[PDB]
């Protein structure tokens, strides 16, 4: 187990963009930008 490791950047275009978006989404909190019907 724990063999596979995530690659540094990708030329795919969109998959690498949502991966970028992920790094940023965890980098900052920001407002939820929703009403949020959750406890």
């Amino acid at each position: 187990g724990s063999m596979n490791q995530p690659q540094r950047m990708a030329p795919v275009g969109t998959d690498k963009e949502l991966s970028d978006l992920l790094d940023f989404s965890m980098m900052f909190p920001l407002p939820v930008t929703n009403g949020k019907g959750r406890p």
């Binding site: 963009e17 970028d20 790094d23």
Partner: protein, 92 residues
């Protein structure tokens, strides 16, 4: 002994660090950095400079970046500001 700060304060430092990375990478085109934050941030910053798709709607990545820069532009009237979004929000 908590060192957790007020919820508004703690989220303010972390959100400012995100902006400071956007500011860093906007000025930073050098290869002298090898840290992960700079690599992904320069990727997206040089991208946003060559991305008409962001105003064309079909790019959520730049939607994140303009969200930092918008909140930041409300307080920052800097005309010499590194962030291209920040100007294009408070000028237009």
């Amino acid at each position: 002994g908590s060192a957790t700060q007020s919820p508004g304060d703690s989220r303010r430092l972390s959100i400012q660090r995100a902006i400071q990375s956007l500011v860093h990478a906007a000025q930073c085109r050098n290869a002298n950095c090898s840290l992960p934050s700079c690599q992904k941030m320069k990727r997206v910053v040089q991208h946003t400079k060559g991305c008409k798709r962001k105003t064309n709607g079909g790019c959520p990545i730049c939607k994140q970046l303009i969200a930092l820069a918008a909140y930041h532009a409300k307080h920052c009237q800097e005309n010499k500001c590194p962030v291209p979004f920040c100007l294009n929000i408070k000028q237009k």
